[PDB]
Design a protein around this ligand. Structure first.
Ligand SMILES: Nc1ncnc2c1c(Cc1cccc(NC(=O)Nc3cccc(C(F)(F)F)c3)c1)nn2C1CCCC1
Length: 254
C-alpha cells in the first residue's frame, strides 16, 4: 500500500520473545537484527495497523522506530536488546542499578515524551511495561496492546491529554525507584480510585530522596494544567545531581 510495505521473505522470525498476536526477534533482509510483532486473527487489520500509522509520523531518538510493515500482519521496528524496563528492573540487573542510573533512564523517557508533547500527541499508556531498554541503559518509549497508572480525569471521564501522561510518568518514577514493584501495593483497582480522589498519593519510596518524591507529587496534581511539561521534567532529571541533590551518596539499593 505504501513506502513502508515489505516482503515477508525479508524477515526471519528467529526467536519468540513474547506472547499476546506476539513478538519475535526476526532479521530484516537477513542482515539487520529487528523485532517482529505479529497478529493472530484478533482485531481488524486496519485496527492493528493504527499502531504503525502513528509510528510513521513520530521519529525521535527515545522512541522505538518503525522500520517496515507487512499488510498480508507484521510490524517491524528496531530491536531493543534488553526487553522492557519492567523485566530489566526485575531481572538480576535491578540490584545493580542505583539512583544515577535510574534518573538517567527517567530523563530519557521524559525526553521522548517531550517530543510527543511538542508533536501534540498523547501516548495514553506510559508505564514501565511499555518502555524498552537496549544497550548502555538506553530507553525508548514503545507500545504493544491500567488504572493504577492512569490519571483521574482520564479513567473517569476519558479526558486523555499529555498532562494525563505526566500523571503516568509520575507513577513510572515509583517503578524506577522501587525497581519494578507494582504501584499502590496491597491495593485493588476500585480501591486505588476511591482513594486517590480522596487526596491519597503514594508515599516516598525507601531510600528515595524526598526531592524526587516532590516531583512525583507534581506529576500527580489534581488540576491537570498544574502538572509539568515533559520539557521541565527532562531538564529536571538532567540536572538532578547538580541542581537538586549535589550531596547525594550511594545507598544500600539506591
Ligand atoms: N524492539 C523490541 N525488541 C525486543 N522486544 C520488544 C521490542 C518491542 C518494540 C515494539 C515491538 C512491536 C510493536 C511496537 N509498537 C509500538 O511501539 N507502537 C507504538 C504505537 C504508537 C506510538 C508509539 C510511540 F512512538 F509512542 F512509541 C509506539 C513496539 N517490544 N518488545 C517487547 C517488550 C518485551 C517483549 C518484547
Amino acid at each position: 500500500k505504501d513506502a513502508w510495505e515489505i516482503p515477508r521473505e525479508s524477515l526471519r522470525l528467529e526467536v519468540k520473545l513474547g506472547q499476546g498476536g506476539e513478538v519475535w526477534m526476526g532479521t530484516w533482509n537477513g542482515t539487520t537484527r529487528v523485532a517482529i510483532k505479529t497478529l493472530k486473527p484478533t482485531m481488524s487489520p486496519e485496527a492493528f495497523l493504527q499502531e504503525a500509522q502513528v509510528m510513521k509520523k513520530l521519529r525521535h531518538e527515545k522512541l522505538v522506530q518503525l522500520y517496515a510493515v507487512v499488510s498480508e500482519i507484521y510490524i517491524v521496528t528496531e530491536y531493543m536488546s534488553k526487553g522492557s524496563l519492567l523485566d530489566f528492573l526485575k531481572g538480576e540487573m535491578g540490584k545493580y542499578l542505583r539512583l544515577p542510573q535510574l534518573v538517567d533512564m527517567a530523563a530519557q523517557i521524559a525526553s521522548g515524551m517531550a517530543y510527543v508533547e511538542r508533536m501534540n500527541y498523547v501516548h495514553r499508556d506510559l508505564r514501565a511495561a511499555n518502555i524498552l531498554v537496549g544497550e548502555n541503559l538506553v530507553c525508548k518509549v514503545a507500545d504493544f496492546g491500567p488504572i493504577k497508572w492512569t490519571a483521574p480525569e482520564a479513567a473517569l471521564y476519558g479526558r486523555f491529554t499529555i498532562k494525563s501522561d505526566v500523571w503516568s510518568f509520575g507513577i513510572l518514577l515509583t517503578e524506577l525507584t522501587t525497581k519494578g514493584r507494582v504501584p499502590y501495593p496491597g491495593m485493588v483497582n476500585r480501591e486505588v480510585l476511591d482513594q486517590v480522589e480522596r487526596g491519597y498519593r503514594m508515599p516516598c519510596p525507601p531510600e528515595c530522596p524526598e526531592s524526587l518524591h516532590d516531583l512525583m507529587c507534581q506529576c500527580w496534581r489534581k488540576d491537570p494544567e498544574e502538572r509539568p511539561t515533559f520539557e521541565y521534567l527532562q531538564a529536571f532529571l538532567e540536572d538532578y545531581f547538580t541542581s537538586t541533590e549535589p550531596q547525594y551518596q550511594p545507598g544500600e539499593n539506591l
